[PDB]
Amino acid sequence: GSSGSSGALENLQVEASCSVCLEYLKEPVIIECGHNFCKACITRWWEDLERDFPCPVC
Template structure:
């Protein structure tokens, strides 16, 4: 199944420049483009103005601003940035690998390469998910597993 964030990125992109839409406009056939891209695409045309996607022609350079789509594009940009930042935060600073274990001795998450390194070889390591449940304590852990509502 396609990643919903990737689908959103594709839908929020201009099919001419392949970047996020900037100052999006909708043309007669219903396709959206950056105002700058479609203006350049049609720059030398005088009479018939074809859509770069479906080739349907229009007799006029009818460009209508699509402010709602512009707002959605901005939201997509922010989501993508937040996802990228979250991905960076869940990686080991030393190795760039995903954090998978929790070192009880150092009280810090570590990656699989850290686990086998000299620095952590003799330390008590547990899967990161287990450490998160233990950190909640018995009452919160039980509550999160559905045993207690509240």
């Protein structure tokens, strides 16, 4: 029996995470919009050279 693992009780550290899969990453791709996107995701949409395109999530 071991409790106390996850939670925001108290810790000096900030991190982000994808929006689609909601996975924890070290360096999330912050597109123009701002939302977080992982290579696995950001890629699914950024498949073509459609640089000019609105955020999918928004």
